[model samples]
Target: PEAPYASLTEIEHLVQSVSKSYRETCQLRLEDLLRQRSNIFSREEVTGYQRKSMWEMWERCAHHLTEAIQYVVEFAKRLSGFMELSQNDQIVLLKAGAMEVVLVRMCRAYNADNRTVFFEGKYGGMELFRALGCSELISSIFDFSHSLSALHFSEDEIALYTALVLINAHRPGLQEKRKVEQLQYNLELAFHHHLCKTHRQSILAKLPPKGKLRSLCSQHVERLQIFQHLHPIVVQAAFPPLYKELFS
Candidate 1:
């Protein structure tokens, strides 16, 4: 095995170079779509045209989220050792992690102070979430976002963590799981090298536990399930037939 320090330097360079394009793409889209507007509304304010606009915003955000997933997959493929995998192996890893990556990015829209989550640059209150029975989901993401903000992860750290999320060989259907696992192990070393330097004795020392990201993802899945059940009802009532088809 490579010496940990040596491997860390090499992998960190690869992470910086390979993830640059995807990171730029995500940031550009995030700024254009999420940074400019601020239409804040309570649950009572979400009827009539406001409801239509909210659903439109949701559709737009969903589109951006889909685009982010592709860039994330691209970032994964460009990692130093990941491109050597079979296409099937790559697809297996992506299917497992792409949505998690999207959630990771989307958490940026969470405003901890106001307990609001923004969609298409418009902020919606917790009351809307509670009415939809996903208030817990919003609250969990709020806490997650708060923790992330407090950590103040540098771009390199976020990239490395994104790499870890992507290269998991435990995902089913890979032809030679061990090969991918080896690459995953390398990313883990680099991640710990960076994290421990900043957090070893701090309150956030245990911040990057193996399962923390996975736990966030599981809750995100539950939130998505709850939202999908509500989407049809909400869209059908609020949107025209064409918009309904696009959103519902």
Candidate 2:
């Protein structure tokens, strides 16, 4: 019966509403993103230097990356205080954090036991992605997902955590750092209390380090630039506007 948490319950309610929206938005997208059934490729087919195959891989990856972005936007819109941020800050957050959010979302596609992520409707292990030729990135994603998946978060924590990833007030060039920090602090409080209230004490030990997300996102953009360099014409003609808007 401490007197301190007066409106903390209100913040908790806000987090729940947005998290529920996230789960709903997430359900539809995950089904769409993961449901396509495709034939398995022999290791030989994906490991070679074939231009058309590489182009298709770019198309496939870009399309999914673009679509995944929509969900992140929708989730952010549902956060109670997010829309109140300056428009520039909003774009900055989305631009800076979008890929990191996507990588967190990848844990949904991750199957740790098999060391695979759902791809084009099948469980795609790293070898399946060898044709894209960014071995470093593919390996990093698996390592990231494997550890993230091992944490065994429930839906609410996933929603809360993804929103937290986007609300970092320390992100440079924020017009309203204090206001953004207010939101960040509230959401962080909500997440902390949620773990406390639910008695998921062990996960606290496993709470992912915030620093890791930033580096993984940088790795993503590095590989993405390298991917874009090899096929400039196609990337010029076909890269999704938002993908280039935030990615390049």
Candidate 3:
């Protein structure tokens, strides 16, 4: 076995701990800023340059932190458990591992800057988006027709709803054209009274599984990963070789 938990693990652990603490500090500071800036916008303010600027800053910072933490975790995973290698191999691995960690952190931060804009915009309301999920939107549009069995939503509307729902479903790579086609069929069924066959066909033609929802949701998943990605780094760092023996 390689050094199971050595300097590499310790370094990763330390960095992740510091990163999390840094994030907390940023959160508190931003909260304070928000408190102080309470009057900057009116209640009617839907969106504006000021809000955009605020969101931009939060997005850039949070994303960079997440990326930095990813590097820490990935490096730790690759570098841990390497104590028994030949000295030459150990040296090479150590160097490579170090470089990878450094690059990973840098890349992670860069990626975050690119990705954090929407999250920053979402800020607080993100909770509801997750809580209700995309299905809620479809339900709202159709008034739970599938549940209600009234099926009053127009075929065009149902077609749009089904398309939106298809886009929102997870595991995009696993999605099939037939599944989308089935959803369209269901949509047509739901709106049979309101839409003639020609109109239903037209709506399906217009709605044939465009790719916007997948792209949007995938990016959001990555954003959510920012919250989930740092744990192993702390675990590796916290449980060093000495840590094991002391507990044993």
Candidate 4:
């Protein structure tokens, strides 16, 4: 009902169209925060792969995720007042929150009954990803997705949740934290306002994700680190350079 509360609806479209087969762009340009160079593309082909083992399948998902993360860049930039933060702060907050938001987006594509997630237009069952070797992380991915999907959030709610995830005020190395804090509180106000609009006799909180996102990212990173330790050579060859910057 408030101004900024309804204003967050603008960001809902981007979240709804998180990934597309074809490429897209926006008017806002923060090359420093979301850099793209002719020689350094954000996403590249897998180059080569043999999916007999967990490693190749994992790399394939990593490559898919890298592309989505590119889309995430544009989504965050479109948020109101997010661009006012210094360029350095922008990078710090984005790098911190990228995977968490991506995982939340994962809930949109997940099919709870089948226990499968859609990627590149096909549903892959939980067992299909079991070969990735970090069954714990995979299980948690599904668990988190399952929990989030159960809420059946509206696209606007999801967008506000995503903004909450991205505009964190307390991330490490964040300068002008007071500025970030104020920005975050505005988003929080909008989020709660919309949450009430959706319904009240329910189990929604100020924010549905925070520590859970943190632990999920940590689990995925540990798996990332394990893969790097065991197959540093393959890791180097398998994913895009941007994957390293964000996750490695």
Highest-scoring model, TM-score:
2
Rank candidates by lDDT, best first: 2, 4, 1, 3
Worst 10 residues of 3 by lDDT: 108-117
Clashes of each: 0, 0, 7, 0
Off by over 4 Å in 3: 1-184, 191-209, 230-248
> Which residue pairs in candidate 1 have backbone atoms (N, alpha carbon, C) closer than 3 angstroms, thus clashing?
none
Report the lDDT tens digits of candidate 3 across residue range 118-199: 2233322222123223334423322211221223333234323422232221322322434434333433333442345335
Model 2 per-residue lDDT tens digits across residues 62-162? 76776777778878777877777777888778877878888888887877665666765456578776557778888988888888888877778888888
What TM-score would each prediction reach against the true structure?
0.68, 0.83, 0.23, 0.71
Q: What is the C-alpha lDDT profile of model 4 across 10-70, one tens digit per residue?
A: 4333333322211232222223212221222111222222234776676777667656667
lDDT of 2 at 13: 86
Clashing pairs in 4: none
Q: Write the per-residue lDDT of candidate 1 for residues 56-136, one digit (tens) a residue.
A: 545554456556665676676667766677767766777668667766665566665565666533676555533334457
Off by over 4 Å in 4: 1-51, 200-203, 206-210, 228-248
**Distance (Å) between predicted and true CA of 247, model 3?**
30
Task: Please give me the total number of clashing residue pairs in predicted model 1.
Answer: 0
Ordered from best to worst TM-score, the candidate numbers read: 2, 4, 1, 3
Residue-level error in angstroms, candidate 4, position 241: 12
lDDT of 2: 0.73
C-alpha local distance difference test of each model = 0.61, 0.73, 0.32, 0.62
